[PDB]
Each structure stands twice: as structure tokens, then as C-alpha cells.
Amino acid sequence: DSRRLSIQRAIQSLVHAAQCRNANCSLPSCQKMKRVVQHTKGCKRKTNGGCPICKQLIALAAYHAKHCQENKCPVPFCLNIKQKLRQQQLEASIDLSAYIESGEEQLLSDLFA
């Protein structure tokens, strides 16, 4: 539960930052989040080049995106991560369909394998 609450707080910070138009915003979590998001906009390394700042922000956005129900969400990376998660769900569904279609005798064999 501890890490879940930590993630929850950080998601709250990201959600606020994403919709905050006050350059004079006094919330330190907002100021910090805006700097991190600005970094990700220009970074050439990104996650595959090993950038810890990008990896941390995208991981946070992914935890947000998993539960996000907003079609025009302003959170950085949210829409794009939801697209990736939808594709993964489709692939999982296609796999499951093929497995169910393989039939009773197959499933029974596997169950007792």
C-alpha cells in the first residue's frame, strides 16, 4: 500500500501540472513536474538511450494512463500510452481467441499438463 500511495501522490502532481497555466504556481511539486515534462519534450536520449528522467516520467504517466478515462487528457504521454495499452489488449484478446478456438481436448490436455 505504501508504494501505491506514493504513486498516487505523484500522479496527482502530474495531473495538476498538466493543467496548470500559472507560471507563478506556488506548489513545489508542480514546479518540479513542469521542469521534468519540459526536459522530456526536448530529450534526444529518451528511454531507449537510458535517460532516467524520461524513464521516471513515462513510468508515472503509464500508471496514470492505465486508469485514465479522459479522451483529450492533457497529461504528457497519456494518449500515446493508452494507444499502446489498447494495442496490447487487442493482441492479448486475439491470443485468447485463438486459444479458446483450439478446443476442449486441447484445454483439458493443458490443464493436466
Binding site for Zn ion (CB under 5 A): 20, 25, 27, 30, 43, 51, 53-54, 68, 73, 75, 78
CB of 8 to Zn ion, least distance (A): 14
Residue whose CB is less far from Zn ion, 10 or 78: 78
What is the DSSP code (8-state) at residue 33? H
C-alpha 50/C-alpha 80 separation (Å) is 20
CA distances to 105, 108, 110 from 17, rounded to whole Å, are 54, 52, 49
53 is written with which cell numbers?
Answer: 528522467
CA distances to 1, 19, 29, 57 from 10, rounded to whole Å, are 14, 15, 8, 10
CB of 9 to Zn ion, least distance (A): 15
CB of 93 to Zn ion, least distance (A): 22
Residue whose CB is less far from Zn ion, 7 or 27: 27
Which amino acid type is present at position 3? R
CB of 12 to Zn ion, least distance (A): 12
Residue whose CB is less far from Zn ion, 35 or 108: 35
Residue whose CB is less far from Zn ion, 52 or 103: 52
Helices (H), 48-111: 52-65, 78-101, 104-111
